Amino acid sequence: VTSLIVRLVAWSVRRPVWVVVLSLLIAAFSGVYVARHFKINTDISKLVDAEPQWAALSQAVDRAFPQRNGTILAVVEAPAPEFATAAAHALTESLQKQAAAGRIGPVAEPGGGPFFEHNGLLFLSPQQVADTTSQLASARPLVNELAKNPSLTGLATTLSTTLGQPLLTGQVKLPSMAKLLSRSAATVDDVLAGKPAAFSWRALVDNDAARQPARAFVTVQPVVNYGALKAGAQTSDVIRETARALDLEKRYGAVVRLTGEQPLADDEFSSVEDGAALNGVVTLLVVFVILWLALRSKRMIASVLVTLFVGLVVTAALGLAMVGSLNMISVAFMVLFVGLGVDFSIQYGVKYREERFRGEAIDAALIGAAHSMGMPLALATTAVAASFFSFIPTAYRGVSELGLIAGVGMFVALLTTLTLLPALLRLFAPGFPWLAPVDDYLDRHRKPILIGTLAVVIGALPLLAFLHFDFNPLHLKDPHSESMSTLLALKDSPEAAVNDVTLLAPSLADADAAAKRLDALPEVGRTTTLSTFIPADQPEKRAAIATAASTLLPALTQPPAPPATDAQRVAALKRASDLLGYAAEDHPGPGAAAAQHLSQSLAKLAAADSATRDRAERAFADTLRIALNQLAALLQPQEITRDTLPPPLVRDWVAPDGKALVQISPKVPKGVDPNDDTMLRHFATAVKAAEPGAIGGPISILHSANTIISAFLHAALWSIISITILLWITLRRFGDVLRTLVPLLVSGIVTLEMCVVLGMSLNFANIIALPLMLGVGVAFKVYFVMAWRAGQTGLLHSSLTHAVLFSAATTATAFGSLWLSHHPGTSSMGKLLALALTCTLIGAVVFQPVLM
Amino acid sequence: MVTSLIVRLVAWSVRRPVWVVVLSLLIAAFSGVYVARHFKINTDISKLVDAEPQWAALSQAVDRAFPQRNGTILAVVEAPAPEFATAAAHALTESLQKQAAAGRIGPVAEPGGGPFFEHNGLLFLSPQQVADTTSQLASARPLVNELAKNPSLTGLATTLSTTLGQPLLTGQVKLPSMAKLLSRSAATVDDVLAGKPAAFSWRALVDNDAARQPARAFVTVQPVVNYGALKAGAQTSDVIRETARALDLEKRYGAVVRLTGEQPLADDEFSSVEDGAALNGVVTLLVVFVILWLALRSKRMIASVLVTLFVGLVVTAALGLAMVGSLNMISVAFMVLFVGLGVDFSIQYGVKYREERFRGEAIDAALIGAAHSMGMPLALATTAVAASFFSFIPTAYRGVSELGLIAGVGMFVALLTTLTLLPALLRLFAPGFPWLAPVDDYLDRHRKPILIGTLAVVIGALPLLAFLHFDFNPLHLKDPHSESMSTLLALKDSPEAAVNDVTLLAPSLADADAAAKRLDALPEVGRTTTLSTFIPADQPEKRAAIATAASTLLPALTQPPAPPATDAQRVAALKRASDLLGYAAEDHPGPGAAAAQHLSQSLAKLAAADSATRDRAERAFADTLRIALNQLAALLQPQEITRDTLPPPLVRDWVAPDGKALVQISPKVPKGVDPNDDTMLRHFATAVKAAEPGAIGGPISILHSANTIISAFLHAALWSIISITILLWITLRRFGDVLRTLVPLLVSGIVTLEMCVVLGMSLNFANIIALPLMLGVGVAFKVYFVMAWRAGQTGLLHSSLTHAVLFSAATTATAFGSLWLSHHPGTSSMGKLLALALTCTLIGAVVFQPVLM
């Protein structure tokens, strides 16, 4: 091995110009080869390989319902549910205009469109339907005043009316109105504050839930042909354009969000690249300064950098030649190359600079440094390359592609350091007092310090019991990205299919039989099928609805109201405020404290401006005109049979043939947050134990984690075996193999032991750094044992001069570039690599009195 | 020259035995009498774990104000029907009441609901719920009237057959509406036909809110003010088991009484450690005996080691009680540790003498000769193993600070006991393996891979440590099949028992109300109870509504006694109801028709068995109706919500005589999550403790009592090696000999944790004592292994066995097996980790022979 390295350099020194014109030509073809098939792919199912079983179920639900995977989910958020529901209608119509032009796919609001705006009263239970119709029967006089009032002046007139005589008559009571007046006075104070609001008539009567931001969903399914186009900005962009043109949504108080399959998988990649174009170029500067520190020969630094970039282009050229696609995690190889690959040129470049000052000539300096850096560089390279190759045999294409590109990149770095650099180094013709007190302490006391930390690495050994794993990928995919911020927002929403698994069935009768088997499980909870949308006994409900509609609809459709002038408005506000004050003092009670709160607000609102009263009317009246439209539409349902359903509602639940999928939203108790590890694993593992054909959500996430766990466990077992055998081949002394194995063990525990002390959880992308630190762990023992073989009376003195820490400065610079990546998944990987490097560097200086 | 000092003590022991024999035997008599005169076993949970002087103030603040609250054993009276349950509490309560005032036990009461709650129970229902609850009973007046006048089977079957007859045809009553009544009667009727007990419960059918299958009735009794723990009367634990024993009506009421408390739950743990542990102790010696005969095969040698073993053990116990006194649940497990580690020291000396004597020497020269080669070895292993026990002394984990103390003096005795008594004893008296050939040949000729082939895989099994998990709650460590524990693990679902409620104390009732109402703001707090919560809202409007319902319901409830219908009319009234059920199902069909036909089958077959089996269903259907109507009679006359009505004891154990009001906080358990949930109870404890620090009692005490155990466990692991590493420095001054035995410690320390992931072991509290304690055994066996590997460096599987080590481990492994076999996982999992950590130095040393020596 040694002579082969000397021959390969002696040729490079023999024909220097021949190597340069050969390298730049290959550098040209590699640059040509890179651009002609450069591609970045952000598919999320490629970053992990599931077995053919799970692939059949996933494609079964997909090939049957080809749209389900591509359906966008557009959240529309407004301060009031009517303003949200009406904004859904305001936007559902615009997307419909282009769905017919092939611009997008079939648009609908699965939360509940007109089919739910009329028949939503039918989906209720048998008894509480009769209860809801009873309350709407006794409230006939209230809605009779509400459908006729001239809005804010009339709302203040129907207010002042009830506060005057009906309190004296003893019919209406003040404490009962507290629920209305407290929410009325609060909404009035918002308009006086200057911040937007909306008086929700729904949350103050029918709806018990007053959740803060009422939202409305509208889904656009993918275009039929798809395939994307440069001019075809596609369905994610179309929603952006239509809602932009509406502007009405700024008058509705609505914002349009998005999520789905492809917006997040593309947004998470963009989280890695925020700054990465600039974050990587400051690394080259930090490498440069450290590069100049090791070899302060300007005639050398330019030559060292040229070898760095030539091997860098051939890396991507050969990389795209054998993987085809540069995925999300595998794109981080470029940063790892400059950090680890430059080490080959720094370790070799300073020995040449050493030989020149030692007293060698042009021949003897290059081929003489190859005898020092011969099997060392071969050891370090194939050890690091064996670590990247450890994820190759496993079906983890996220790292299997990164290791393949990085592994062959380590051999293209040696071949560049061994030929191109000596050729350039041929054409280009080229004291530490602060370490003194450290080595005096160290060399006089590295006898028990070694025994000291070895006792402490056994002392903190129980800390490994608290070594905790992180299981849900939500933490590492940039939770503040646009698609992940909304995905996490609508987690606690019923029709938001965030956490429900989708089991497929042959027929609808089979799907209903499967739906009952699942509702028997304690964690399953809500399951919906196409038959779930046909209410049990409809004819009985419509009779109670028809009776409630015979007395309400005459009182709901009243003649229009007079546009009240401004003078009547201030009068209606002052006369409603002053009547609220006397109502709270003459009738003292729990609502009296709330009634006086409204008087303070109405009197201030009455004596306020004029623009603030038109806006306040819009927050009180426009919602009331939309709330009454929802009531008149809800009181007129129709028969619902399988053939009386909308066309797309069946297409979403039954494809050609009878294939009916069963979505299973988990039974989430109120305290448990809907996105935890404990219950979603319990749900997904129990509903799968029942029906093995269920995939789609937490079941696919759960099985994807078990694939990654069975991945890095093999790679960590693959590395050592491929490393130990590699060490035994080059160094045949087993006293030299155990010499580089005990430091790996010690350095391996402390990284895990510091994970408990520093309080960091090993997650997914964070755990990739453990198998890699074996090939980098031994590769630094190669550099370190050389800096001390020439002399070891000062371990930190010799380490600087012989340029080993400078080697680490380059590598730590690379690990720090993945640390500052905004994307918390990549930022969690670079944190482990760098912290494990420190536990190896310090570990070496402490643990080399043993193993040298 | 510690070796020369050891010789002075052994050479003196030889030549003159009669001095040694009578000097140590007399001490054993003095030592044995001290053990019998002072043998105090405590069972309090606080003696096993300490806490800050601050947390002991919160514990005693609630205790001094409420002395009774600590030992109020909650006795569950569980019956098939709530009325059979609620009335079974009355039978038990009224009998204990005859001994509460007799001074036999403390004051007796029933928390779930005595007479005060059976009357005012409707006053605690919020204003709107009772408004609809009161109005519903008005429409059931004809129904309850037909039930009050007919508390018999024939009568019940008559009101049954009457409803299915005319009103079912006219549509006055609908058949589907009779779903709960028809389907759950058919279920209860089929139960009586099978022969198994049951009870139609008018509660879960009429009120219909909850149909929980084991109805439970609670009764809390307190302890006597002057608590003396006499023997003429077993304390309140067995008094409830004595009165309700002969009450016998509980076998007729249908309920058994189970008990749980604070002291009766802690003693069930200790008694679980001693299921047959007394037998387990005597069988361990027999196993060590067989190992002793395999080691020094001669009668006079075995009897020598056993006689000196009992002396060192009887003085360890006498010393132990002389400086700790307490011999709690963990401390009592030292004797099995002694028989393992004590015979260990003698196995070395016995077989070294034997070879050295049989190598061509006299007895007197071999006793003093073998003490040379085993001076530093036995001295190192002794203090190094005892330095692991002593690592728990400074920390506040008194369950182990007492065990580590008694075990430390055990090793310092077992050494001295072997060096003097064993030679002088043996001085008074006087006395080939071919199956290792392929195994030793393989390992000896291939130690190049096996060392590297495992040191690699140990590095490859390092990510497994990321899946090592800590079990935080002591409930798993608790013995689950004891009667007191099995009840507390069943009361997770019941709120009035409230097994995990933090108890915050406040100066005044207005202060506690301020603190109790405030705590409700936090999401995990749920229900907080004070005496002001016993004052049911502000409901004279509920007096007006209930009084109106009483004027029409009570006259229909107090009917004249029905003449007991004869037996011949019963088969009539049941066949009349059955054939009517059959018709009512098919001619007027509906969803209830499938159940109406079902009852008809079960009802008809009930009428065709026995006159006794009919009377059997009467005790299930009718005797329940007596109490179901009796419950309603008292429940309709509620009286006032005024503070002064609250009985004397409710004021005593809820507010304080000083005025210190107490808040009990039951966590908001989401209906899906099991109430005894590890993560969310610890979430509830931290939120309550952070908002109001004065809270202690339940989850907070259990949560914090673990944090101090983790701090004591982590210190001992650090304190063990520093004691051991400095000790290795001193004995063997070659640092190449300190690191020689320290690297295999690190290696053997990881492989146990890595196996805890492969095997799947969790690392609880008792499971974790083995981590700091195995640091001594790790360096102690590398002392034993290295001596066997002086003359026989090749064929080391041979040498380790014949030169002492394997018969030594067989005494240690057997000792750890006796801990493994106990019932209490707080002593049965400690034996599993120890034995599994021992196999990583018995194999780890043999594998790492080149690194050792």
Side-chain angles (χ1 to χ4, degrees), chain B residues 77 84-98 110 219 243-244 247-250 253:
Chain B
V77 195
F84 277 160
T86 51
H90 272 250
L92 213 181
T93 309
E94 88 165 20
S95 183
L96 300 177
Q97 196 61 260
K98 308 183 184 307
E110 29 194 15
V219 53
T243 71
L247 248 59
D248 212 331
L249 260 176
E250 322 313 311
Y253 270 69

PDB file of all heavy atoms in Angstrom, chain B residues 77 84-98 110 219 243-244 247-250 253:
ATOM      1  N   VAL B  77     -67.304  -1.436  50.098  1.00  0.00           N
ATOM      2  CA  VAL B  77     -68.362  -2.436  50.170  1.00  0.00           C
ATOM      3  C   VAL B  77     -68.975  -2.509  48.777  1.00  0.00           C
ATOM      4  O   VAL B  77     -69.847  -1.706  48.428  1.00  0.00           O
ATOM      5  CB  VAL B  77     -69.408  -2.090  51.235  1.00  0.00           C
ATOM      6  CG1 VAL B  77     -70.266  -3.302  51.545  1.00  0.00           C
ATOM      7  CG2 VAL B  77     -68.733  -1.568  52.491  1.00  0.00           C
ATOM      8  N   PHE B  84     -78.238  -2.380  46.704  1.00  0.00           N
ATOM      9  CA  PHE B  84     -77.619  -3.437  47.496  1.00  0.00           C
ATOM     10  C   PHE B  84     -76.264  -3.000  48.033  1.00  0.00           C
ATOM     11  O   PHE B  84     -75.824  -3.490  49.079  1.00  0.00           O
ATOM     12  CB  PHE B  84     -77.468  -4.713  46.667  1.00  0.00           C
ATOM     13  CG  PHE B  84     -78.712  -5.551  46.610  1.00  0.00           C
ATOM     14  CD1 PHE B  84     -78.883  -6.489  45.607  1.00  0.00           C
ATOM     15  CD2 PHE B  84     -79.703  -5.412  47.567  1.00  0.00           C
ATOM     16  CE1 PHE B  84     -80.023  -7.266  45.552  1.00  0.00           C
ATOM     17  CE2 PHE B  84     -80.846  -6.186  47.517  1.00  0.00           C
ATOM     18  CZ  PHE B  84     -81.006  -7.114  46.509  1.00  0.00           C
ATOM     19  N   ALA B  85     -75.591  -2.084  47.336  1.00  0.00           N
ATOM     20  CA  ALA B  85     -74.316  -1.560  47.814  1.00  0.00           C
ATOM     21  C   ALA B  85     -74.528  -0.465  48.853  1.00  0.00           C
ATOM     22  O   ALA B  85     -74.008  -0.549  49.972  1.00  0.00           O
ATOM     23  CB  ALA B  85     -73.489  -1.036  46.637  1.00  0.00           C
ATOM     24  N   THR B  86     -75.297   0.569  48.498  1.00  0.00           N
ATOM     25  CA  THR B  86     -75.511   1.688  49.413  1.00  0.00           C
ATOM     26  C   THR B  86     -76.138   1.236  50.725  1.00  0.00           C
ATOM     27  O   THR B  86     -75.842   1.806  51.781  1.00  0.00           O
ATOM     28  CB  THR B  86     -76.385   2.756  48.753  1.00  0.00           C
ATOM     29  OG1 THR B  86     -77.568   2.147  48.222  1.00  0.00           O
ATOM     30  CG2 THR B  86     -75.625   3.452  47.630  1.00  0.00           C
ATOM     31  N   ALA B  87     -76.999   0.217  50.684  1.00  0.00           N
ATOM     32  CA  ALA B  87     -77.561  -0.313  51.919  1.00  0.00           C
ATOM     33  C   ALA B  87     -76.578  -1.222  52.645  1.00  0.00           C
ATOM     34  O   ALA B  87     -76.640  -1.337  53.873  1.00  0.00           O
ATOM     35  CB  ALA B  87     -78.862  -1.063  51.631  1.00  0.00           C
ATOM     36  N   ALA B  88     -75.668  -1.869  51.910  1.00  0.00           N
ATOM     37  CA  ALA B  88     -74.650  -2.691  52.559  1.00  0.00           C
ATOM     38  C   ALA B  88     -73.682  -1.841  53.368  1.00  0.00           C
ATOM     39  O   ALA B  88     -73.170  -2.299  54.396  1.00  0.00           O
ATOM     40  CB  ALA B  88     -73.891  -3.516  51.521  1.00  0.00           C
ATOM     41  N   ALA B  89     -73.414  -0.613  52.919  1.00  0.00           N
ATOM     42  CA  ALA B  89     -72.610   0.301  53.723  1.00  0.00           C
ATOM     43  C   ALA B  89     -73.299   0.611  55.044  1.00  0.00           C
ATOM     44  O   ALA B  89     -72.645   0.698  56.088  1.00  0.00           O
ATOM     45  CB  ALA B  89     -72.337   1.588  52.946  1.00  0.00           C
ATOM     46  N   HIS B  90     -74.627   0.765  55.017  1.00  0.00           N
ATOM     47  CA  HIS B  90     -75.368   1.075  56.236  1.00  0.00           C
ATOM     48  C   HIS B  90     -75.261  -0.049  57.257  1.00  0.00           C
ATOM     49  O   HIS B  90     -75.070   0.205  58.451  1.00  0.00           O
ATOM     50  CB  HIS B  90     -76.833   1.353  55.902  1.00  0.00           C
ATOM     51  CG  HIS B  90     -77.113   2.784  55.562  1.00  0.00           C
ATOM     52  ND1 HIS B  90     -77.834   3.617  56.390  1.00  0.00           N
ATOM     53  CD2 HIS B  90     -76.770   3.529  54.485  1.00  0.00           C
ATOM     54  CE1 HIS B  90     -77.924   4.814  55.838  1.00  0.00           C
ATOM     55  NE2 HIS B  90     -77.287   4.787  54.680  1.00  0.00           N
ATOM     56  N   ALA B  91     -75.393  -1.300  56.807  1.00  0.00           N
ATOM     57  CA  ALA B  91     -75.246  -2.428  57.719  1.00  0.00           C
ATOM     58  C   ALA B  91     -73.864  -2.437  58.358  1.00  0.00           C
ATOM     59  O   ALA B  91     -73.731  -2.634  59.571  1.00  0.00           O
ATOM     60  CB  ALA B  91     -75.506  -3.740  56.980  1.00  0.00           C
ATOM     61  N   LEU B  92     -72.824  -2.200  57.558  1.00  0.00           N
ATOM     62  CA  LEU B  92     -71.470  -2.163  58.095  1.00  0.00           C
ATOM     63  C   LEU B  92     -71.261  -0.924  58.959  1.00  0.00           C
ATOM     64  O   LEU B  92     -70.637  -1.001  60.025  1.00  0.00           O
ATOM     65  CB  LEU B  92     -70.458  -2.204  56.947  1.00  0.00           C
ATOM     66  CG  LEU B  92     -69.109  -2.911  57.126  1.00  0.00           C
ATOM     67  CD1 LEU B  92     -68.286  -2.801  55.854  1.00  0.00           C
ATOM     68  CD2 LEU B  92     -68.322  -2.395  58.307  1.00  0.00           C
ATOM     69  N   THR B  93     -71.789   0.224  58.523  1.00  0.00           N
ATOM     70  CA  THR B  93     -71.560   1.474  59.243  1.00  0.00           C
ATOM     71  C   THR B  93     -72.244   1.470  60.605  1.00  0.00           C
ATOM     72  O   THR B  93     -71.652   1.896  61.604  1.00  0.00           O
ATOM     73  CB  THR B  93     -72.047   2.662  58.412  1.00  0.00           C
ATOM     74  OG1 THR B  93     -71.498   2.582  57.091  1.00  0.00           O
ATOM     75  CG2 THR B  93     -71.622   3.975  59.052  1.00  0.00           C
ATOM     76  N   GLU B  94     -73.492   0.998  60.669  1.00  0.00           N
ATOM     77  CA  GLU B  94     -74.225   1.029  61.929  1.00  0.00           C
ATOM     78  C   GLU B  94     -73.657   0.056  62.954  1.00  0.00           C
ATOM     79  O   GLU B  94     -73.908   0.223  64.152  1.00  0.00           O
ATOM     80  CB  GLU B  94     -75.708   0.734  61.692  1.00  0.00           C
ATOM     81  CG  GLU B  94     -76.070  -0.742  61.719  1.00  0.00           C
ATOM     82  CD  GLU B  94     -77.564  -0.971  61.848  1.00  0.00           C
ATOM     83  OE1 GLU B  94     -78.339  -0.038  61.548  1.00  0.00           O
ATOM     84  OE2 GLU B  94     -77.964  -2.082  62.254  1.00  0.00           O
ATOM     85  N   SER B  95     -72.899  -0.952  62.515  1.00  0.00           N
ATOM     86  CA  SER B  95     -72.279  -1.872  63.462  1.00  0.00           C
ATOM     87  C   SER B  95     -70.962  -1.316  63.991  1.00  0.00           C
ATOM     88  O   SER B  95     -70.690  -1.398  65.194  1.00  0.00           O
ATOM     89  CB  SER B  95     -72.062  -3.236  62.808  1.00  0.00           C
ATOM     90  OG  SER B  95     -71.526  -4.164  63.736  1.00  0.00           O
ATOM     91  N   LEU B  96     -70.131  -0.754  63.105  1.00  0.00           N
ATOM     92  CA  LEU B  96     -68.919  -0.081  63.560  1.00  0.00           C
ATOM     93  C   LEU B  96     -69.248   1.117  64.437  1.00  0.00           C
ATOM     94  O   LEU B  96     -68.457   1.480  65.315  1.00  0.00           O
ATOM     95  CB  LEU B  96     -68.077   0.366  62.367  1.00  0.00           C
ATOM     96  CG  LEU B  96     -67.561  -0.671  61.376  1.00  0.00           C
ATOM     97  CD1 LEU B  96     -66.819   0.038  60.264  1.00  0.00           C
ATOM     98  CD2 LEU B  96     -66.658  -1.677  62.064  1.00  0.00           C
ATOM     99  N   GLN B  97     -70.405   1.745  64.209  1.00  0.00           N
ATOM    100  CA  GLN B  97     -70.821   2.863  65.046  1.00  0.00           C
ATOM    101  C   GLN B  97     -71.010   2.432  66.494  1.00  0.00           C
ATOM    102  O   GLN B  97     -70.843   3.244  67.412  1.00  0.00           O
ATOM    103  CB  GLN B  97     -72.111   3.471  64.496  1.00  0.00           C
ATOM    104  CG  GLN B  97     -72.436   4.848  65.045  1.00  0.00           C
ATOM    105  CD  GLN B  97     -71.359   5.867  64.728  1.00  0.00           C
ATOM    106  OE1 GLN B  97     -70.521   6.184  65.573  1.00  0.00           O
ATOM    107  NE2 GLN B  97     -71.378   6.388  63.506  1.00  0.00           N
ATOM    108  N   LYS B  98     -71.351   1.162  66.721  1.00  0.00           N
ATOM    109  CA  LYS B  98     -71.494   0.644  68.075  1.00  0.00           C
ATOM    110  C   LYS B  98     -70.154   0.442  68.766  1.00  0.00           C
ATOM    111  O   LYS B  98     -70.127   0.274  69.990  1.00  0.00           O
ATOM    112  CB  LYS B  98     -72.272  -0.674  68.048  1.00  0.00           C
ATOM    113  CG  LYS B  98     -73.595  -0.586  67.305  1.00  0.00           C
ATOM    114  CD  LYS B  98     -74.358  -1.899  67.361  1.00  0.00           C
ATOM    115  CE  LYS B  98     -75.633  -1.826  66.538  1.00  0.00           C
ATOM    116  NZ  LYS B  98     -76.471  -0.657  66.919  1.00  0.00           N
ATOM    117  N   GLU B 110     -69.189   7.318  56.471  1.00  0.00           N
ATOM    118  CA  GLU B 110     -69.194   6.868  55.078  1.00  0.00           C
ATOM    119  C   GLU B 110     -69.086   8.067  54.147  1.00  0.00           C
ATOM    120  O   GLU B 110     -70.008   8.904  54.111  1.00  0.00           O
ATOM    121  CB  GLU B 110     -70.453   6.055  54.777  1.00  0.00           C
ATOM    122  CG  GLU B 110     -71.665   6.433  55.611  1.00  0.00           C
ATOM    123  CD  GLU B 110     -72.767   5.392  55.534  1.00  0.00           C
ATOM    124  OE1 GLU B 110     -72.493   4.266  55.069  1.00  0.00           O
ATOM    125  OE2 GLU B 110     -73.909   5.699  55.938  1.00  0.00           O
ATOM    126  N   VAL B 219     -66.895   3.442  53.273  1.00  0.00           N
ATOM    127  CA  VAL B 219     -67.020   3.759  54.691  1.00  0.00           C
ATOM    128  C   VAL B 219     -65.630   3.951  55.291  1.00  0.00           C
ATOM    129  O   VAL B 219     -64.840   3.005  55.392  1.00  0.00           O
ATOM    130  CB  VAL B 219     -67.833   2.679  55.437  1.00  0.00           C
ATOM    131  CG1 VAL B 219     -67.275   1.282  55.187  1.00  0.00           C
ATOM    132  CG2 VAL B 219     -67.874   2.979  56.930  1.00  0.00           C
ATOM    133  N   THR B 243     -66.309  -7.324  62.478  1.00  0.00           N
ATOM    134  CA  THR B 243     -67.736  -7.032  62.575  1.00  0.00           C
ATOM    135  C   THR B 243     -68.459  -7.435  61.296  1.00  0.00           C
ATOM    136  O   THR B 243     -69.399  -8.238  61.325  1.00  0.00           O
ATOM    137  CB  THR B 243     -67.954  -5.548  62.876  1.00  0.00           C
ATOM    138  OG1 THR B 243     -67.619  -4.769  61.721  1.00  0.00           O
ATOM    139  CG2 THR B 243     -67.088  -5.115  64.044  1.00  0.00           C
ATOM    140  N   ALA B 244     -68.022  -6.894  60.156  1.00  0.00           N
ATOM    141  CA  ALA B 244     -68.581  -7.293  58.868  1.00  0.00           C
ATOM    142  C   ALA B 244     -68.370  -8.771  58.576  1.00  0.00           C
ATOM    143  O   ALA B 244     -69.003  -9.300  57.654  1.00  0.00           O
ATOM    144  CB  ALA B 244     -67.975  -6.447  57.747  1.00  0.00           C
ATOM    145  N   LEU B 247     -71.487 -10.027  60.477  1.00  0.00           N
ATOM    146  CA  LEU B 247     -72.707  -9.366  60.028  1.00  0.00           C
ATOM    147  C   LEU B 247     -73.506 -10.273  59.100  1.00  0.00           C
ATOM    148  O   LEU B 247     -74.742 -10.246  59.106  1.00  0.00           O
ATOM    149  CB  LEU B 247     -72.370  -8.045  59.339  1.00  0.00           C
ATOM    150  CG  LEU B 247     -72.798  -6.771  60.073  1.00  0.00           C
ATOM    151  CD1 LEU B 247     -72.168  -6.696  61.453  1.00  0.00           C
ATOM    152  CD2 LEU B 247     -72.431  -5.549  59.255  1.00  0.00           C
ATOM    153  N   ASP B 248     -72.812 -11.068  58.283  1.00  0.00           N
ATOM    154  CA  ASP B 248     -73.402 -12.140  57.483  1.00  0.00           C
ATOM    155  C   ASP B 248     -74.415 -11.633  56.461  1.00  0.00           C
ATOM    156  O   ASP B 248     -74.538 -12.205  55.373  1.00  0.00           O
ATOM    157  CB  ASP B 248     -74.049 -13.186  58.395  1.00  0.00           C
ATOM    158  CG  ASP B 248     -73.991 -14.585  57.811  1.00  0.00           C
ATOM    159  OD1 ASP B 248     -73.982 -14.715  56.568  1.00  0.00           O
ATOM    160  OD2 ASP B 248     -73.946 -15.554  58.595  1.00  0.00           O
ATOM    161  N   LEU B 249     -75.153 -10.572  56.798  1.00  0.00           N
ATOM    162  CA  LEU B 249     -76.036  -9.945  55.824  1.00  0.00           C
ATOM    163  C   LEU B 249     -75.280  -9.476  54.591  1.00  0.00           C
ATOM    164  O   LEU B 249     -75.882  -9.355  53.520  1.00  0.00           O
ATOM    165  CB  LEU B 249     -76.774  -8.763  56.459  1.00  0.00           C
ATOM    166  CG  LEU B 249     -78.216  -9.008  56.909  1.00  0.00           C
ATOM    167  CD1 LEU B 249     -78.770  -7.778  57.614  1.00  0.00           C
ATOM    168  CD2 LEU B 249     -79.091  -9.393  55.725  1.00  0.00           C
ATOM    169  N   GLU B 250     -73.976  -9.217  54.716  1.00  0.00           N
ATOM    170  CA  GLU B 250     -73.183  -8.829  53.555  1.00  0.00           C
ATOM    171  C   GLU B 250     -73.116  -9.952  52.529  1.00  0.00           C
ATOM    172  O   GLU B 250     -73.049  -9.690  51.324  1.00  0.00           O
ATOM    173  CB  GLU B 250     -71.781  -8.413  53.997  1.00  0.00           C
ATOM    174  CG  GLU B 250     -71.750  -7.633  55.306  1.00  0.00           C
ATOM    175  CD  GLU B 250     -72.778  -6.515  55.352  1.00  0.00           C
ATOM    176  OE1 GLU B 250     -72.847  -5.722  54.388  1.00  0.00           O
ATOM    177  OE2 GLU B 250     -73.527  -6.438  56.348  1.00  0.00           O
ATOM    178  N   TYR B 253     -76.819  -9.279  51.482  1.00  0.00           N
ATOM    179  CA  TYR B 253     -76.847  -8.011  50.759  1.00  0.00           C
ATOM    180  C   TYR B 253     -76.127  -8.125  49.422  1.00  0.00           C
ATOM    181  O   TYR B 253     -76.417  -7.365  48.490  1.00  0.00           O
ATOM    182  CB  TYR B 253     -76.209  -6.905  51.604  1.00  0.00           C
ATOM    183  CG  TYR B 253     -77.159  -6.157  52.518  1.00  0.00           C
ATOM    184  CD1 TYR B 253     -77.725  -6.776  53.626  1.00  0.00           C
ATOM    185  CD2 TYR B 253     -77.471  -4.825  52.284  1.00  0.00           C
ATOM    186  CE1 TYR B 253     -78.586  -6.089  54.468  1.00  0.00           C
ATOM    187  CE2 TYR B 253     -78.328  -4.133  53.119  1.00  0.00           C
ATOM    188  CZ  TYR B 253     -78.883  -4.768  54.209  1.00  0.00           C
ATOM    189  OH  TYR B 253     -79.737  -4.078  55.040  1.00  0.00           O
TER     190      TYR B 253
END
